[PDB]
Amino acid sequence: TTIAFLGLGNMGAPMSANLVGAGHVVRGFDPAPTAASGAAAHGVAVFRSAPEAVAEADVVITMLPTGEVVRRCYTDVLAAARPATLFIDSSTISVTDAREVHALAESHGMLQLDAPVSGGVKGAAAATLAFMVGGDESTLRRARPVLEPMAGKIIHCGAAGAGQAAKVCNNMVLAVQQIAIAEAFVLAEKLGLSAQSLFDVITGATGNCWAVHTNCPVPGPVPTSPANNDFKPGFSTALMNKDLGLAMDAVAATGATAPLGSHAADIYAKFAADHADLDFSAVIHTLRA
Amino acid sequence: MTTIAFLGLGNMGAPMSANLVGAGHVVRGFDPAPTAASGAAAHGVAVFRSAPEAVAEADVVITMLPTGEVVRRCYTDVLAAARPATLFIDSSTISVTDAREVHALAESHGMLQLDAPVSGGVKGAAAATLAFMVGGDESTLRRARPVLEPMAGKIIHCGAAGAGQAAKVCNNMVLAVQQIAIAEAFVLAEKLGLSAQSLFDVITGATGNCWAVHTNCPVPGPVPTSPANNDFKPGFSTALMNKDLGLAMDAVAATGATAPLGSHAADIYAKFAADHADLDFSAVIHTLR
Ligand SMILES: NC(=O)c1ccc[n+]([C@@H]2O[C@H](COP(=O)([O-])OP(=O)(O)OC[C@H]3O[C@@H](n4cnc5c(N)ncnc54)[C@H](O)[C@@H]3O)[C@@H](O)[C@H]2O)c1
Ligand SMILES: C[C@@H](CCC(=O)O)C(=O)O
Ligand SMILES: C[C@@H](CCC(=O)O)C(=O)O
Structure with a gap:
């Protein structure tokens, strides 16, 4: 499985290291050189743009600060992705922004999950994050092998x-x-x-x-x-x-x-x-006070 | 097996007192609501005409009363009637200020006193699974344990x-x-x-x-x-x-x-x-x- 990891910050860096550690080919993008360098140091092939990272990926994971940035990322990469790519957003964003980017991705023939996480940097490093997942049960099943090396717990919450x-x-x-x-x-x-x-x-x-x-x-x-x-x-x-x-x-x-x-x-x-x-x-x- | 006066034979006091009778204590009851008193007599409480009479020959006096004011008034009514060094346990739920006041009053009359309010409600009271949260001296609680155990799932000493x-x-x-x-x-x-x-x-x-x-x-x-x-x-x-x-x-x-x-x-x-x-x-x- 080839995974594009978009957002290689405090959480994204250790998550992507665990994916590398479990035998995936990990492609990455982060607009901060220090984040990108660090990720490349653990086996992520780092690209100059997010659409480049996405080009050969079977799975695209985002870990980004806000729904506006997630949304922009999606409209920037969706045309570069292969059809039926699995998009998983693990950012913590509003329910409204979640559903909107979900609809956007599916309108391109992609499969998409919201999968925000609890556990912090410590949990991310230790591969014990708790993923709370929205989306189709059959999409989550397909995603499970990618989520498992990052996770202590994976819960399907609904649509x-x-x-x-x-x-x-x-x-x-x-x-x-x-x-x-x-x-x-x-x-x-x-x-x-x-x-x-x-x-x-x-x-x-x-x-x-x-x-x-x-x-x-x-x-x-x-x-x-x-x-x-x-x-x-x-x-x-x-x-x-x-x-x-x-x-x-x-x-x-x-x-x-x-x-x-x-x-x-x-x-x-x-x-x-x-x-x-x-x-x-x-x-x-x-x-x- | 000691003699216990039980003042307050209501929703909580009635089943509490019944467990004390079942454990073999002699229980001397008073409650000015005749309905409550009648119900307690049916399960073996010897009911008295007045609170001072119920307490006159008791090793232990338990109060299970609605408010701090009622506890204060009851103590004022009965303390001089009790034998010196009788152990008063108040299992009413009352303000911390009221508790300290009644405690000091009981002690100024030569009585031992604990606050022992409970959780568990009526079902807990009937089943003898109440938690007693106790304030007072450790040695007084030691003296009190045989009386509290037949009513209790947990007894915890909380401090003074x-x-x-x-x-x-x-x-x-x-x-x-x-x-x-x-x-x-x-x-x-x-x-x-x-x-x-x-x-x-x-x-x-x-x-x-x-x-x-x-x-x-x-x-x-x-x-x-x-x-x-x-x-x-x-x-x-x-x-x-x-x-x-x-x-x-x-x-x-x-x-x-x-x-x-x-x-x-x-x-x-x-x-x-x-x-x-x-x-x-x-x-x-x-x-x-
Ligand atoms: N009922 C619950 O579920 C529950 C749970 C935990 C704690 N508590 C606490 O237990 C205490 C008693 O609750 P209850 O539900 O048994 O109340 P209740 O009103 O059913 O019983 C109080 C009884 O005290 C009697 N009484 C009043 N003045 C008296 C006096 N001077 N001498 C003797 N008896 C007197 C009343 O006539 C009445 O029967 C309260 O402080 C309450 O907050 C209740
Ligand atoms: C066991 C866990 C995934 C495997 C793991 O990463 O520990 C889960 O399925 O919740
Ligand atoms: C609460 C008490 C047990 C009495 C009981 O089990 O009813 C104790 O263990 O001290």
Whole structure:
């Protein structure tokens, strides 16, 4: 399988290295020389333009920052692709942009999936990413052998756009929980209830969630959590702020009522103005702002 | 086998007291609602004419009462009647401030005292699977264990007087926020065209998982035992969640803490309780459609 990998940044570089490692021929493009060089260093044949990379590919993967850039990439390469090429967008973009690029690709006789990922740079390097997939079941089946060497988990969420919608709904919940857990720790501390006690109760009770059992925002109860390491990501406030922006786009596009999700989004946008580089659990310290 | 006075023989007290009788304790009951008292007598509680009489010959006094004010008043009524160094356990859910006040009052009368509020509701009470979250001295809890075990699935020592109440109220605030957030996610998914089943599968397999979805799923289908499938019959009523959120807001106000989402969830539940006090708190999903 020949794969064109368009977007060889912090996530795209290690993903493409895993594809090389699993015996694929990987062709690449990235407009940053340092990204492109690094990728070429791990066996990717790097081209000057995206249409060139796409020319001989059976699979085209995108990992790009915004739906506008994904859309532009598609209209730039689709005429250069061979018919029935499999396009997989693993960018995190709005559900609307997802469905539009899906329709665009299929109108050219291509097969297309949205497959955004959770797990970060660490997961990308370790080939444990979670792919949340929208599109036809039979297209996902064809894609499976390409996704497997990058992935710890592959979930079919529904029709085109469903992968984006699933990830955005999960991350909106996550942001709310990380804030709620932080509020609970600071309340407990003011009430004279130790962090370890609150942790022991909440993790054995209805309030338990990853935000506490793994990402506990106070040092001590979970020695590996970012709070014990100067809030080094982990999952950065910058990235969380990006997902919540998308969640607010989806809320605006649908007219949905999302009071706590929107409030979380407000909170994280403000926090990202100061602390974008810290793990999102660091929000515990911006509560008095 | 000791003698226990049980003051408050209502929805929670009646089944609690029945388990104490079944374990071989002599249980001396008082409740001024004759209906509650009658029901408790039927399961073997010896019912007295007055709270001071029930407590006069008890090693342990348990209160399971509606509010801090009622607990305070009850203590004021009975403490001088109890024998010196009688062990008072308050399993009512009351403010942390109220707990500390009643605790100090009990001790100024020469009584041992714990706060031991519970989770599990009436089904937990009947089955003797309640979780007791205990504040007070470790040695008093040691003295109390034989009495709490027949009623309990879990007994956890949370810290000094008031810490049981604190732990509960912190957990329940988180829970209220999670239940709204999950509701928001499911409604947003529906608007995006992502199925409830698929959102369920994703969130429960991802970082957003929590009891509010995996057990209390607010859409019918994915968890057939959740209230959504049984006309939102509680479960954990909106009336009770609204009470616990009032207590959290008392704690927030007493401490000067900042709890944006917890307070926003308090406002949401206070509004929903005006008309849907009788519905499971997962029914708040209704306000988002
Ligand atoms: N019901 C639940 O599902 C649940 C779950 C967890 C915790 N709780 C908490 O348990 C406590 C009791 O709940 P409940 O559902 O049994 O309430 P309830 O109203 O059914 O019972 C309270 C009982 O106390 C009696 N009472 C009032 N004043 C009294 C006095 N001075 N002496 C003796 N008895 C008196 C009332 O007459 C009543 O029968 C509350 O603080 C509640 O928040 C309830
Ligand atoms: C096992 C996994 C793909 C194989 C892998 O990359 O670990 C999956 O199918 O979810
Ligand atoms: C909660 C108690 C067990 C009593 C029971 O199983 O009912 C204990 O293990 O301490």
